[PDB]
């Protein structure tokens, strides 16, 4: 469903800020930062082609740590994203990759949820008062120079010191049950079109730490989509806590090292990885989020009070009605229909998954979340001659159309530059 494109504008980084879709802006609870030039590429969704020194206090220096410090699966370049055509490339890449996602029926579905996925207005200490949470906002510099507060859902931002960072260390005392309480909060995705990962086409090698160089290339659109499915659990508040984890007995090598994997990661991947979330336990999650919804439904029915935007009590009321699929009765009251809850739930946690996105994209991809990366490559998907919205790297009317030759790296070698090999380097 890309008949009308997701980004309707041709964007280049150098364009004069208008204070609307191209504006210096500031993110919440950084009062420090110099305003940053950002771009609104679609309603509720913004893009910040700078590397992220902001959101988290801990990083904020892109300098590489000592080499005795660094783990093999880390990669550091302090100069990346520093120039203009670079940030120009970034906008162009991120844009395409959305359009790609958006031309699949799955992508169209998903993205619609993400737009509709507005963070609940929970800010008030007063239970009968409707209050938007201000962490859910950005602050944008209007053409006059005055600040305007603007509510959003998603931000695509450049990386941090570690470009390939495969896990977050970031989040701890941040008060965000917003992701597990059904509220949702505005998600911040760190992402680079300009890099992607090597992997092996055979299961026995791919799940082996000691074997292979990464013959094939992950399609960044599969990568972006993945964070977007994460983002969707975390906009609706149905995300699973990171400390729920699977101690891995499915792999000798993982198990040897006591590596654990968060249920949220297994769910996000989907496929045959989802049975490793215990059906027993999963129903517990279900009932929880189903009850979490009954709380949002209640809170909605109590509230006679708002904090004025232009918006009335009943306009926003219907916005969250739509978001959670609520059932109103003759008396004007909201409830949670147990059918539509499971509808919504099945959709986010099951229908939208990395596995299925691989189905739509007609691409080669890692068969399981539990596997061992081989390489990281530098890429450029901006030239149409490298990469397209419809065919990705495997380009129709070329020798790369068939047998996944576009992702084939010894064939398309023109299109990739290896940076690191992770093989053998793993902690074993």
């Amino acid at each position: 469903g890309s008949h009308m494109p997701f980004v309707n504008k041709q964007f280049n980084y150098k364009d004069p800020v208008n204070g609307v879709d191209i504006a210096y802006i500031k993110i919440p609870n950084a009062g420090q930062m110099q305003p940053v030039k950002a771009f609104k590429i679609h309603n509720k969704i913004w893009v910040i082609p700078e590397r992220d020194t902001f959101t988290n206090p801990e990083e904020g220096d892109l300098n590489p740590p000592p080499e005795a410090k660094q783990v093999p699966v880390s990669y550091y370049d302090s100069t990346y994203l520093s120039t203009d055509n670079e940030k120009d490339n970034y906008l162009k890449g991120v844009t395409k990759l959305f359009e790609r996602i958006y031309s699949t029926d799955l992508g169209r579905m998903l993205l619609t949820s993400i737009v509709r996925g507005i963070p609940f207005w929970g800010g008030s200490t007063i239970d009968t008062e409707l209050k938007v949470i201000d962490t859910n906002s950005i602050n944008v510099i209007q053409p006059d120079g005055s600040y305007r507060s603007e509510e959003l859902n998603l931000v695509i931002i450049g990386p941090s010191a570690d470009i390939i960072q495969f896990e977050c260390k970031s989040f701890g005392h941040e008060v965000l049950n917003l992701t597990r309480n059904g509220y949702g909060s505005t998600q911040y995705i760190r992402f680079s079109p300009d890099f992607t990962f090597g992997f092996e086409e055979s299961l026995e090698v791919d799940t082996n730490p000691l074997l292979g160089a990464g013959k094939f290339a992950t399609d960044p659109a599969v990568t972006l989509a993945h964070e977007l499915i994460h983002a969707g659990h975390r906009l609706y508040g149905i995300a699973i806590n990171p400390n729920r984890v699977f101690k891995v007995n499915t792999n000798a090598y993982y198990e040897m090292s006591g590596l654990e994997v968060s249920f949220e990661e297994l769910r996000t991947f989907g496929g045959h990885d989802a049975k490793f979330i215990d059906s027993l336990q999963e129903n517990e999650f279900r009932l929880y989020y189903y009850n979490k919804f009954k709380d949002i439904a209640s809170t909605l029915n109590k509230a006679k009070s708002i904090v004025g935007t232009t918006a009335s009590l009943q306009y926003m009321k219907n916005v969250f009605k739509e978001k959670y699929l609520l059932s109103e009765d003759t008396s004007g009251k909201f409830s949670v229909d147990k059918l539509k809850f499971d509808k919504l739930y099945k959709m986010l946690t099951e229908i939208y998954t990395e596995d299925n996105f691989v189905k739509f994209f007609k691409v080669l991809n890692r068969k399981t979340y539990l596997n061992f990366d081989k390489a990281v490559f530098k890429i450029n998907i901006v030239p149409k001659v490298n990469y397209t919205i419809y065919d990705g790297f495997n380009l129709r009317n070329t020798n790369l159309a068939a047998n996944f030759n576009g992702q084939n790296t010894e064939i398309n070698n023109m299109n990739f530059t290896k940076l690191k090999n992770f093989t053998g380097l793993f902690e074993f």
Binding site: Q165, C168, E227, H230, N371
Partner: peptide, 5 residues
């Protein structure tokens, strides 16, 4: 954030 190892 995450892709994992």
């Amino acid at each position: 954030x995450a892709r994992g190892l």
